[PDB]
Amino acid sequence: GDFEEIPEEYL
Amino acid sequence: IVEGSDAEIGMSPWQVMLFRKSPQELLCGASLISDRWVLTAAHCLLYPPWDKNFTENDLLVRIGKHSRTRYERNIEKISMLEKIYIHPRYNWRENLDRDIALMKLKKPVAFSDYIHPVCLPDRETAASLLQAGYKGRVTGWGNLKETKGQPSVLQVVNLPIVERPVCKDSTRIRITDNMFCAGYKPDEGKRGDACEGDSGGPFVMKSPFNNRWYQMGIVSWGEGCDRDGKYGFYTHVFRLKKWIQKVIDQF
Amino acid sequence: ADCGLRPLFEKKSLEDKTERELLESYI
């Protein structure tokens, strides 16, 4: 939850 | 960082965040020393007592960040790692002697207002600035106190380098020439320290001769955070500089 | 090369809020 999601390219 | 303050925008543009792919979490700090090399502490990647042994595909590097948890669209740059190099004589068995590692980026990062490399010291710069009483600056997204919890944005604190005998007499751990300690003494009034999550981040100083920022240390270890009569220990970058060069020159 | 000169500070001749503290300690 804590961390906002990174764009799908990297993860 | 304990007893620090929010960093200003672009105040530490070589600051790098080491981020675990899954689960998604902040592992350590690091620093940008060129368009394709990042410097950090070896213990951020390898520490067998806690069953830690990260490889290239396990991590990401986030550069040009301010906010700890948000994805800073159009500002931060995320990079994959090509290869990790840990000092061959990194001593994880005893006292974290030679706690340093280099990480080569898959592709070069483009510099901007928020992304820019720090300089590595030469013998003369180290000699002139690495003196007891002289202050350096540490940055990170680590814990705010030992045990709010963690900051919303990058924290900064300035600390003085401490005399080697005082560093030695503050702990039972065997100190080496590849480390130096910093922080305020109990009677000095002021406080501040690095804490859990700040490891691998840079201890920098601004040269008064050429007005450039140089990375003199890497946050390595400490026994608690901001405890009276205790000091933070940092990897002595200049003393391991020949190893840095050799890795970069060879790979 | 260009290392250690921040785009939003040194490059523009602007100082951050606490760098003076460092300088004053270099005696």
Ligand SMILES: *[B]([O])([O])[C]([C][C][C](Br)Br)[N]C(=O)[C]1[C][C][C]N1C(=O)[C]([C]C1=[C][C]=[C][C]=[C]1)[N]C(=O)[C][C][C][C]=O
């Ligand atoms: B880092 O974020 O990974 C952390 C930073 C510490 C700030 Br205080 Br300088 N570095 C550490 O936690 C290192 C890695 C292994 C243990 N460690 C220590 O800092 C020390 C003592 C130590 C142990 C073995 C060899 C050298 C030093 N830490 C503690 O045991 C405190 C409790 C840990 C809770 O955070």
